[PDB]
Design a protein around this ligand. Structure first.
Ligand SMILES: CC(C)(C)c1ccc(C(=O)C[C@@H]2CC[C@@H](O)[C@@H]3[C@H](O)[C@H](O)CN23)cc1
Ligand SMILES: *[C@@H]1O[C@H](CO)[C@@H](O)[C@H](O)[C@H]1NC(C)=O
Ligand SMILES: [Zn+2]
Length: 1016
């Protein structure tokens, strides 16, 4: 059956949390290998019967945006690199080259004439040009959601299968800023056999090199058996450039980068240039080079050595191809003919290296260690920890999560039908997938690109959101209209989307008001979509032009509703206060929507002359000295005023929350009899150092612990309703809101750092939970990993990515904070959690960007805050490196990432309207998700195919009885199934033909893919 992911601590040779606890991290001068030691080798190790096999692997690192946009780099650099690679590889049969970024390759290939397309296919088929990874990009591993890592992998590999007839099984990741085990998890389930990484902490490189543990079988932290393991090669040195890839001494290796002699505008900072290889110098030059190679080889276990040969946007000019190739050819000819070296060297590809390593392994020449854990937080030198980019450009980090959900919902809603080509569904979805995939780049979501490049990514994502909206609204109109009435114009807007949290109140005025009136329109249809495979209830809200509005379902049953004002916050430059203003013509109506699994539900909003029977009205209380009136038009309850004071609120039977006179949470009481548990929100600021290294887009280099934000006497607004209550406060740089709907509260921060140079704003929670030095953070929204604060490392080293959540706990109590956007955070003291909101930095931090971060804009960050008793939960033992969410915390995360979608009918009358779609869909167990539903065939295919990715998380057992749910068989969701296959996660290879056309559910922590085939 399924592996137990909770109760069995895996036995591994290297466990990264344990390694961290033991290591001293001393930054000593190691000599020419500045962060290592003087490597020694026995010249007699290699001989006639045991030679060192060396593969020199030419490469070119091509960023899809960084200092220039994607299109700018394509025009100025990449198109020339690819054109000259085609010519030079065609003309020189022994030359080799690897390529990673399929976004660029697809852009190039589609512009080639047919003759050159054929030449290109031939150099791929014969093994000269080899694709590595084959993703659209080389993604960030810290901020990216696993769903989007899979999306971009699939986009690149699907293109490669169709046009190049290849599927890479070796991955190459030389530039992301630290590395996540989410990568081998996805890769191993997508047919991969090997992977390579580079950016790991210099102290980790030294420690693993000393033990020859730089090649390892990387398994997941919970995996007892080892079925998830993927062979991994970690590079040993400071960079992927030529000076740091031939061996330990960059002053020597730089002399073998033949682009650095002068005419290309490049030089060697160690002050010894390369020299052209000649018959008079080749013996001395070979002496030097082979010595570097044999030193590098000492760090690894086989007689097969990998020597990358490349750098950023290399291999651009014909003269560069010639200068590298001819000089290396002269070296190979000498070395391979001199028996005393006992070396055979040649150009190679990445797969050729790994194939030779495993041949050596099978011959019994080496065994490899097992490893679990991650490689965050990275430092490349001294105290320069790269935790800044966990937060940089937070507006676009939030946008990533919004678009993630819109892509999923658009692909799912449109998958139910086959569409005519005239509907442009495939076209719009391909655009949306490619723009989101592009943004996964390690200069996209990371917030590490130049200002105009960030603007390009934003514009691309906005076009993607519009594409998703078009596809979603056409799909809803088709799914909910009587078939013999349905009459689509594929360019028309039948519905508009309403989104309450993006761009958000105070960020953009983007939401449409539903206009009703006795002399214009009495009522309006709205529709909710639920992408999750279980029945779901959620409060939804709409703007309406009257407070006298009632809600009905499509059987005309009344639905209880609440009306509240529309409140907007203003920085009043006259009075120098931050305060709310209410609308006198627009109101919010709020009601509970109930929606089938993967389904739709229709409701109707109707105006009346006076207060409706089933609609209530919130009270409003403004707490401030020196109040002035706040008129609200037709709204039936007058606003009340008071001096600042402590207050308490409770919605339904849920928790009771207490707030300070500054409008910030101070305690949570779970039930009527229970204690008021101290839980305090506080805002603080970090600064920048006045001497030494400065914080920038990459680096977090604080000038000591954070200092409290001076709050003054802020204005607090309290709204109290039967369905929803809230407390909002206008603080310097942040409008902070706590919202209560009967369960764990929602927190929203409208963050505007303004002109506060050299400031990072942090949100901290203070509790009395006895967590000590332990906390938990997630990796890519997929898994929670145990962290240990280490006082032997600086503050910035204790910051980790918070891509979707974090928690602290003791024997009895847990506090979990879930996020709707990736940000950086930590627990710097027992009982605390903190998460960075935004950062504005005037200085460049010397990693090539050449600017600070001064382009901040208002962003609405969203969260859920879950306080729970955990004394009854079955948790992992003290030595287990993982943690797991409870049911309530998991559902709270889903409420942020995949909320209900809301659609407003755009015309006056919807002819043929229906009340529901998906009432007969199975309601699956709460830990199971249909992460992806995607139709894989166009309408002309006789046999239609639909792909599903199914993910089961693992939730803690805490004594809540399980109610029976229904089995979900994705292969029977569409009618007329003829075949069901288990596939790789990219859908590109069939792995299992399934009995009775039934797709089995997956085990906890597992992800599987299935494709159903249908007669059409
Ligand atoms: C010359 C100097 C300014 C001191 C410098 C230093 C370091 C780097 C990198 O680490 C390589 C960087 C790391 C950050 C990342 O944003 C960039 C781009 O992705 C590009 O591919 C090279 N990458 C580059 C330049
Ligand atoms: C694609 O690759 C396979 C495996 O090498 C080969 O059998 C097939 O003929 C190739 N398809 C082509 C060249 O169209
Ligand atoms: Zn890069």
């Amino acid at each position: 059956q399924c592996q137990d992911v909770v109760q069995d601590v895996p036995n591994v040779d290297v466990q990264m949390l344990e390694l961290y606890d033991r290591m001293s991290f001393k930054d000593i001068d190691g000599g020419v290998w500045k962060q290592g030691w003087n490597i020694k080798y026995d010249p007699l190790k290699y001989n006639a019967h045991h030679k060192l096999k060396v593969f020199v692997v030419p490469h070119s690192h091509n960023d899809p945006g960084w200092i220039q946009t994607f299109e700018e780099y394509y025009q100025h650099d990449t198109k020339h690199i690819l054109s000259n690679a085609l010519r030079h590889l065609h003309d020189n049969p022994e030359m080799k080259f690897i390529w990673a970024e399929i976004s660029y390759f697809a852009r190039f290939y589609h512009d080639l004439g047919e003759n050159k397309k054929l030449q290109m296919k031939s150099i791929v088929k014969n093994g000269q040009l080899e694709f590595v990874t084959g993703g659209w990009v080389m993604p960030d591993e810290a901020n990216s959601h696993w769903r989007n890592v899979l999306l971009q992998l699939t986009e690149g590999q699907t293109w490669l299968k169709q046009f190049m007839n290849v599927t890479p099984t070796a991955s190459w990741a030389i530039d992301p800023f630290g590395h996540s085990p989410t990568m081998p998890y996805i890769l191993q389930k997508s047919g991969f056999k090997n992977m390579l990484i580079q950016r790991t902490h210099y102290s980790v490189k030294k420690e693993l090199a000393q033990q020859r543990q730089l090649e390892f079988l990387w398994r997941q932290i919970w995996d007892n058996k080892g079925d998830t393991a993927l062979f991994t090669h970690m590079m040993p040195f400071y960079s992927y450039d030529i000076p740091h890839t031939c061996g330990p001494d960059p002053k020597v290796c730089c002399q073998f980068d033949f682009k650095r002699m002068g005419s290309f505008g490049l030089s060697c900072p160690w002050k010894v240039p390369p020299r052209t290889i000649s018959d008079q110098n080749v013996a001395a030059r070979s002496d030097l080079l082979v010595d570097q190679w044999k030193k590098k080889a000492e760090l690894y276990r086989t007689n097969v050595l990998l020597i990358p040969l490349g750098d950023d946007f290399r291999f651009k000019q014909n003269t560069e191809w010639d200068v590298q190739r001819v000089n290396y050819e002269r070296l190979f000819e000498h070395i391979n003919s001199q028996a005393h070296f006992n070396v055979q060297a040649q150009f190679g590809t990445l797969q050729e290296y790994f194939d030779a390593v495993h041949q050596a392994e099978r011959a019994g020449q080496a065994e490899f260690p097992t490893l679990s854990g991650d490689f965050f937080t990275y430092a490349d030198r001294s105290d320069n920890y790269w935790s800044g980019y966990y937060t940089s450009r937070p507006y676009h980090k939030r946008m990533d999560r919004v678009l993630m959900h819109y892509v999923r919902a658009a692909e799912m809603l449109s998958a139910w039908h086959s569409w005519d080509g005239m509907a442009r569904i495939e076209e719009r979805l391909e655009q949306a997938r490619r723009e989101l995939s592009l943004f996964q780049h390690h200069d996209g979501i990371t917030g590490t690109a130049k200002t105009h490049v960030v603007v390009d990514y934003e514009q691309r994502m906005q076009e993607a959101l519009k594409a998703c909206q078009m596809v979603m609204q056409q799909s809803v109109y088709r799914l909910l209209t009587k078939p013999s009435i349905y009459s689509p114009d594929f360019s028309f807007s039948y519905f508009t989307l309403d989104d309450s949290r993006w761009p958000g109140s105070g960020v953009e005025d983007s939401r449409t008001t539903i206009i009703l009136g006795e002399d214009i329109l009495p009522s309006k249809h709205v529709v909710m979509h639920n992408t999750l495979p279980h029945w779901r209830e959620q409060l939804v809200d709409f703007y309406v032009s009257s407070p006298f509005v009632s809600v009905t379902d499509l059987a005309n049953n009344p639905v209880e509703a609440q009306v509240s004002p529309v409140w907007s916050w203003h920085h009043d430059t006259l009075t120098k206060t931050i305060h709310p203003q209410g609308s006198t013509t627009k109101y919010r109506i709020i009601f509970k929507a109930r929606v089938p699994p993967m389904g739709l539900a229709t409701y109707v909003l109707t105006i009346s002359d006076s207060k409706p029977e089933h609609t209530s009205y919130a009270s409003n209380l403004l707490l401030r000295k020196n109040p002035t009136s706040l008129p609200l038009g037709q709204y039936p309850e007058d606003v009340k005023f008071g001096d600042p004071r402590e207050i308490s609120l409770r919605v339904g039977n849920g928790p009771t929350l207490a707030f300070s006179e500054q409008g910030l949470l101070k305690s949570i009481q779970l039930t009527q009899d229970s204690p008021h548990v101290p839980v305090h929100f506080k805002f603080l600021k970090y600064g920048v150092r006045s001497h030494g290294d400065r914080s920038g887009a990459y680096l977090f280099l604080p000038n000591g612990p954070a200092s409290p934000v001076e709050l003054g006497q802020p204005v607090v607004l309290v709204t109290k309703g039967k369905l929803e209550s809230s407390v909002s406060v206008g603080l310097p740089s942040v409008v902070h809101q706590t919202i209560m709907r009967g369960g764990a509260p929602e927190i929203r921060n409208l963050v505007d750092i303004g002109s506060l140079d050299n400031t990072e704003i942090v949100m901290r929670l203070e509790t009395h939970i006895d967590s000590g030095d332990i906390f938990y953070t997630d990796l890519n929204g997929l898994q929670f990993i145990k962290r240990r604060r280490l006082d032997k490392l600086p503050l910035q080293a204790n910051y980790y990515p918070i891509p979707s959540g974090m928690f602290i706990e003791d024997a009895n109590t847990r506090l979990t904070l879930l996020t709707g956007q990736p940000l950086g955070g930590s627990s710097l003291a027992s009982g605390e959690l903190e998460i960075m909101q935004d950062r504005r930095l005037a200085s460049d931090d010397e990693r090539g960007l050449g600017q600070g971060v001064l382009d901040n804009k208002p962003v609405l960050h969203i969260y859920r805050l879950v306080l729970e008793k955990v004394n009854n939960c079955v948790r992992p033992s003290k030595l287990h490196p993982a943690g797991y969410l409870t049911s309530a915390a998991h559902k709270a995360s889903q409420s942020l990432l995949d909320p209900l979608d809301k659609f407003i009918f755009a015309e006056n009358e919807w002819i043929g309207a229906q009340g529901q779609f998906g009432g007969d869909h199975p309601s699956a167990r709460e830990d199971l998700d249909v992460s992806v539903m995607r139709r894989l065939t166009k309408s002309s295919a006789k046999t239609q195919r639909v792909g599903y990715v199914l993910h089961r998380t693992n939730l803690m057992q805490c004594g809540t009885p399980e109610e029976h749910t229904q089995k979900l068989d994705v292969c029977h969701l569409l009618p007329n199934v003829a075949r069901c296959e288990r596939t790789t996660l990219t859908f590109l290879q069939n792995l299992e033909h399934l009995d009775g056309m039934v797709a089995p559910e997956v085990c906890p922590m597992e992800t599987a893919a299935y494709v159903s085939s249908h007669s059409s």
